[PDB]
Design a protein around this ligand. Structure first.
Ligand SMILES: *[C@@H]1O[C@H](CO[C@@H]2O[C@@H](C)[C@@H](O)[C@@H](O)[C@@H]2O)[C@@H](O[C@@H]2O[C@H](CO)[C@@H](O[C@@H]3O[C@H](CO)[C@@H](O)[C@H](O)[C@@H]3O)[C@H](O)[C@H]2NC(C)=O)[C@H](O)[C@H]1NC(C)=O
Ligand SMILES: *[C@@H]1O[C@H](CO[C@@H]2O[C@@H](C)[C@@H](O)[C@@H](O)[C@@H]2O)[C@@H](O[C@@H]2O[C@H](CO)[C@@H](O[C@@H]3O[C@H](CO)[C@@H](O)[C@H](O)[C@@H]3O)[C@H](O)[C@H]2NC(C)=O)[C@H](O)[C@H]1NC(C)=O
Ligand SMILES: *[C@@H]1O[C@H](CO[C@@H]2O[C@@H](C)[C@@H](O)[C@@H](O)[C@@H]2O)[C@@H](O[C@@H]2O[C@H](CO)[C@@H](O[C@@H]3O[C@H](CO)[C@@H](O)[C@H](O)[C@@H]3O)[C@H](O)[C@H]2NC(C)=O)[C@H](O)[C@H]1NC(C)=O
Ligand SMILES: *[C@@H]1O[C@H](CO)[C@@H](O)[C@H](O)[C@H]1NC(C)=O
Ligand SMILES: *[C@@H]1O[C@H](CO)[C@@H](O)[C@H](O)[C@H]1NC(C)=O
Ligand SMILES: *[C@@H]1O[C@H](CO)[C@@H](O)[C@H](O)[C@H]1NC(C)=O
Ligand SMILES: *[C@@H]1O[C@H](CO)[C@@H](O)[C@H](O)[C@H]1NC(C)=O
Ligand SMILES: *[C@@H]1O[C@H](CO)[C@@H](O)[C@H](O)[C@H]1NC(C)=O
Ligand SMILES: *[C@@H]1O[C@H](CO)[C@@H](O)[C@H](O)[C@H]1NC(C)=O
Ligand SMILES: *[C@@H]1O[C@H](CO)[C@@H](O)[C@H](O)[C@H]1NC(C)=O
Ligand SMILES: *[C@@H]1O[C@H](CO)[C@@H](O)[C@H](O)[C@H]1NC(C)=O
Ligand SMILES: *[C@@H]1O[C@H](CO)[C@@H](O)[C@H](O)[C@H]1NC(C)=O
Ligand SMILES: *[C@@H]1O[C@H](CO)[C@@H](O)[C@H](O)[C@H]1NC(C)=O
Ligand SMILES: *[C@@H]1O[C@H](CO)[C@@H](O)[C@H](O)[C@H]1NC(C)=O
Ligand SMILES: *[C@H]1O[C@H](CO)[C@@H](O)[C@H](O)[C@H]1NC(C)=O
Lengths: 449, 449, 449
């Protein structure tokens, strides 16, 4: 890429940041209970828990049935001693994809640990606090949790005798209906196929009043640097057991790790408007260019957080680009398109290493040190301001200082090769393909002559 | 649609679902009280209600004057000779659509029931609980409802003498300001034209801590199956009255239904990457094809929820394709477009009726029962794998089992034909336009002579 | 623009509203403290504040360091003959934009007032109420506030001795993790550079349970008409100080004003389907047209709220419109394009000042004064209906009355030109990609002839 020619056409080189992709995740098993274990409220709680039980058993049972169905198709013990592993009975599958097979293999791998955690069902159902830990093994422990367990251990407990029992039953019914609305909201897409659908950690967090940090801390991840504090919205987890007896859900989550792709640097750009042909124009370039070993491609940070120093993505998002755009970035400013604007929010000046790139035709350019106006050149449109002209500069309204030097090439004396203009592209451009069509079927009429 | 040549072009036939959408327009009517009724707080409440009342008086009166204007835009009379009424006022609508006329007919249809509900205004204001059902007639009822009644019947009521009265007044002001912010949030677009704008049941439930099925069970809808349980976001409804003295809003909602359009089957597809020209490609076909008696249309599930077995839409969303797409799906794989990718997240193999469609040029394909590689034929690009080759297949890393049979013919032994790709960013269409600019007078240079 | 031919192609003139732009905002300074001042809880608080402080220091300290680092890059003083201008040291900026320069100038303006507010740090940290005021000067005041100060002044305070101190400590821990997650949620993009990123009042109010007009009333701005009730989602604020001692942020917010651009009228339109060629077609014209002294342009309401009488935007969003669309709106219905629709939710009739535009080919049309049907003319598709034919009209299933007159000339008796249909696919481009290439040999063939 040539920054001098692309600055001649009106694009200024922005920051350079890194690219990091999530990769190599380890697994951790969590358990979530659903039944609010009340021990203090055995005086006045009545039958009303069983209505909540009937409403949650409408969704606990079919998820568990599909979960035991999907783990039933796979088997182990490949024929021959040389070949061994998990075998998917694809005749019993019907239609399946690669990630579904991978999830089936993962569930078959975690079936033994699911049975190991299922051995502690009475330990799961005996908890009376919000979040606590129980000894899974000699070195492993579980992370049982309920957000609403605290709500009938710090709010509804002290009103055990001041307030009437039917009012406690009605308030518990309102809270249970609201919580069942929350579980109904979060396990929406999970109802179709609860094996191949990951669970967002924030969607888990709205079950517990939107506290993602409690799940992050009790899960074990402790973000310390600046880069991992923004990260935490990409933690994925899958359900491995859906037990109906204690009415609990055993899930397996993936602890992320931000690996770094070698040699890939994300380069940003700033687009300014320039006055050509009596109109204001902007070059048509993408904002972000990934560069890796003299190779230009495209990415999208639609799902990626952007730090001050790097681009952090959940997964690699490499998109191809047109070779005409590659020639536009490399040498050919004639191959770069331009669009027109007339709105008031167009930047005309910007700073780059102490060098001002400014359109002086619309912006007032002056030097404070000499008190003389600066005129637009006719060989260029974008006008540079450095310490060669004047140190202390009047641009627009503002006093500024400049610094450094162009380095290699001055685009003031360089020729101008602004390419063809493009228009706006709504469904209007399909109507211009329509009048291109009538021009072409005029030429088809002129073919026969 | 032929699935063998569509498997040759790179598409795999996915699941088949239904289009059981829309239903009978049975309705129901409820009452939304705004001012909460305090009865235990007659000791220490001051006149903190007056600021809330002055805040809501700026809201309630415009909807009331708009609705009485809208009733002034219609009469019935008995003009003509066969017509016994239901005429609209001439030119009093100004600018109006068909849905506005339908809303006019709806208010003229329900004004008698609105007067019937308004006959018990003193019965409306005497409620001191959250949700009540009061008898409209002999076998009829409505639902008067106040979700913040509980918060000043279980939280602010017991602190009547423990906490100081000015602190209760301040906290009451805080929750009144918060709840008035909630009404200002939910009746945002409703303030412009409060007769033709429906009300989302989820945004209505957001006034009540997001307890949707509390409103649903108080309404009367009891979804019992899997398909209708996810449904409940298609309730909707329109306000029929905005009474100022009781400060309440009489709402009319529609009880939905799920009828089935006959013969319409939604078909899913899986698009895999194939290695042609030393490059990775995918075919360009839409994901869902609706088929009804040899008729292909297009749909968009931008709002429709997807069940495990069918598609639930609020309303029919039929779209067409080009006839070139119809020939692409029927017989012409040369008319099916393609796209080039280089990203890592491209699946290359999938399963369909125990038959593997695999890109073995990039995927390791072996038979574990015989320990031999599976090689790509030069005639095919996508490899069919069944039990005729080998029962246990190594694909990728995984042991899998195949089964069933082929189905008519195979896609491997068929001829393959392909076409050019194209993308967005119409600067290439701009160069094509300049090509037309030079081309049309490239024609009229040396035709004759 | 005409409305006779434009309704003859099927577009009906909607309401005419105004255009207003937010302009000239003044500045007011607020302060936001973050450490919850507990005074009643000195009996049982333990050291749970220390973990919250350790969590929030990693956010507070680098924001303050970046703020003072950006503060160092601007200097004042006289550049020889010029008096002042706040000279920006451009060597200490790297790459900067115009908005960043304006923000640096804003903080250079606000350093003195930030120091004046920072002189009352012990006054800031001593507040034990939710929202209260302190005297900044003889005529200026500050607006120190918390949404969660009340929560440990009305909820956790009365359970000082009834509930155990470790349960109070755990409840405070859970609520502090939840609120620390709230600050991590709202200050997401602010951590990259906390000077150039504006702060929305909505996400700020999300820290205080979504009570927007509590913040608005503490600011002092008050809405009084219909147009300012919907306005309230566009308040812009910027960080001016990030003090780590009392752990508070001094913020400067911009109280706005809705200025009116003169002569600009936003025109809406209603597009109906018309039956041509045995099929339903939809004309392709934009819904909104801004007209200002015979000047058509394009706008987008992607962020602008729409009131009953005007358009309220955060900033001007004028876009150029095509000269082919200028011929479409002025004279040439051939330039007005079309598309082919088949879905059932297409309106075919509408009312405009007692003028019925009705496609009577698909809609039943009658006059029950005479009890006869109304037929379709061959010279037009859209049916003109006024009181000259019959004053009381039957359209579809609805019985209406009309008035007024035609409007200059009737839109039924003329003949209008037509545009071609379009689609939403790049297939056409690929067609031409080889088409013009094939027709190129044909052009030379004409030359050969
Ligand atoms: C999940 O897998 C289990 C285990 O069965 C094994 O896997 C199947 C896929 C087949 O390949 C089996 O041959 C294989 O053993 C299946 O559970 C089994 O279900 C059957 C009924 O389908 C049960 O038989 C019943 O048993 C008693 C006998 O007294 C009577 O009630 C009935 O007469 C009937 O025969 C059987 O006990 C049960 N268990 C075992 C170990 O075979 C299961 O069908 C399968 N699928 C699902 C969806 O759960
Ligand atoms: C909505 O409609 C009511 C009812 O009036 C009926 O509908 C109107 C659209 C017109 O077609 C009327 O002719 C028709 O009766 C309107 O309320 C009426 O408003 C008028 C004033 O516009 C009232 O007249 C006043 O009455 C007393 C007489 O002592 C004095 O205060 C005034 O001198 C004045 O004459 C009238 O009483 C009232 N009611 C009726 C039954 O006619 C209403 O104006 C209309 N529009 C709106 C915007 O509310
Ligand atoms: C922000 O600015 C302050 C003020 O410094 C002034 O502005 C800077 C932008 C430069 O132009 C300075 O020349 C100018 O004075 C900076 O504080 C200063 O930091 C320096 C170190 O960077 C301190 O020097 C130290 O001082 C003592 C001397 O006994 C010893 O510890 C060291 O040997 C060392 O020399 C200096 O005292 C201090 N104050 C002043 C008034 O200069 C500050 O660093 C700067 N930037 C940031 C990121 O905070
Ligand atoms: C409440 O429950 C706790 C925990 O089980 C127990 O220690 C306490 O004694 C109970 N109190 C009453 C009054 O039941
Ligand atoms: C593009 O640039 C190359 C050198 O980088 C040059 O040879 C070529 O002619 C240019 N093409 C244009 C300006 O169209
Ligand atoms: C640009 O070229 C001019 C002559 O046109 C020359 O005076 C000037 O020094 C050049 N600038 C450079 C090489 O930076
Ligand atoms: C293109 O033009 C031809 C000839 O006028 C017309 O028949 C055809 O429908 C048009 N096609 C498209 C896709 O615009
Ligand atoms: C509180 O209100 C309820 C319901 O109206 C009533 O039964 C009760 O007596 C009231 N209590 C007091 C102390 O006013
Ligand atoms: C595929 O075609 C080949 C010849 O090209 C033939 O030998 C083979 O039997 C065919 N397989 C089918 C029809 O399944
Ligand atoms: C290209 O330009 C104009 C429109 O700008 C068009 O009318 C003309 O036919 C085209 N060709 C030439 C040779 O100008
Ligand atoms: C609680 O704090 C308030 C306000 O500072 C004070 O008036 C009151 O005495 C305190 N009460 C106790 C029990 O400490
Ligand atoms: C466009 O309209 C003008 C008058 O406004 C007319 O002279 C001209 O012929 C029209 N052009 C068409 C229909 O192509
Ligand atoms: C429409 O044209 C007819 C002649 O075809 C004429 O009689 C009639 O008055 C016209 N209507 C107008 C101009 O409104
Ligand atoms: C059409 O011709 C142009 C110019 O030679 C070429 O760039 C383009 O690839 C061709 N398109 C096809 C599909 O052959
Ligand atoms: C497919 O069949 C159609 C006729 O139905 C034909 O026009 C097309 O060329 C065929 N596909 C080929 C040979 O590319």
């Amino acid at each position: 890429v040539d920054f001098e020619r692309l600055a001649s056409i009106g694009g200024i080189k922005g920051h350079s940041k890194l690219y990091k992709i999530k990769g190599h995740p380890t697994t951790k098993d969590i358990v979530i209970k659903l039944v609010p274990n009340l021990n203090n409220l055995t005086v006045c709680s009545e039958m009303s828990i069983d209505g909540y039980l009937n409403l949650i058993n409408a969704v606990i049972i079919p998820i568990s049935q599909s979960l035991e169905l999907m783990r039933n198709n796979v088997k182990d013990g490949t024929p021959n001693e040389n070949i061994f592993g998990a075998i998917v009975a694809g005749a019993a599958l019907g239609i399946a994809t690669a990630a579904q097979v991978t999830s089936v293999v993962a569930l078959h791998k975690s079936n033994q640990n699911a049975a190991k955690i299922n051995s502690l069902r009475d330990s799961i159902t005996k908890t009376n606090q919000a979040v606590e830990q129980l000894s899974l093994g000699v070195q492993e422990t579980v992370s049982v949790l309920m957000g609403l367990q605290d709500q009938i251990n710090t709010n509804l407990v002290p009103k055990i005798n001041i307030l009437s029992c039917k009012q406690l039953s009605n308030t518990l019914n309102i809270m249970l209906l609201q919580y069942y609305s929350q579980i109904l909201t979060v396990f929406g897409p999970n109802l179709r196929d609860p094996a191949t659908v990951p669970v967002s950690i924030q969607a888990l967090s709205q079950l517990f009043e939107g506290n993602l940090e409690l799940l992050t801390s009790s899960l074990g991840i402790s973000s310390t640097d600046f880069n991992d504090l923004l990260t935490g919205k990409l933690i994925t987890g899958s359900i491995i057991w859906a037990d109906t007896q204690g009415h609990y859900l055993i899930l397996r989550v993936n602890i992320p790790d931000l690996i770094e792709v070698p040699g890939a640097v994300i380069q940003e750009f700033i687009k300014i408007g320039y006055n050509f042909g009596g109109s204001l124009w902007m070059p048509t370039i993408p904002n972000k260019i990934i560069i890796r070993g003299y190779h230009l491609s495209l990415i999208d940070s639609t799902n990626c957080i952007i730090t001050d120093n790097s681009y952090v993505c959940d997964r690699d998002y490499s998109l191809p680009m047109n070779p005409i755009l590659r020639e536009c970035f490399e040498g050919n400013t004639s191959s770069c398109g331009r669009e027109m604007v007339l709105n008031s929010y167009i930047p005309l000046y910007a700073l780059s290493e102490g060098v001002i790139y400014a359109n002086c035709l619309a912006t007032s350019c002056k030097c404070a040190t000499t008190n003389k106006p600066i005129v637009q050149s006719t060989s260029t449109v974008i006008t540079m301001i450095d310490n060669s002209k004047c140190p202390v500069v009047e641009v627009g309204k503002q006093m500024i200082s400049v610094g450094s030097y162009l380095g290699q090439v001055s685009p003031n004396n360089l020729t101008i090769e602004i390419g063809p203009p493009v228009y706006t592209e709504p469904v209007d451009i399909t109507n211009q393909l329509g009048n291109i069509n009538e021009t072409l079927s005029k030429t088809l009429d002129l073919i026969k002559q």
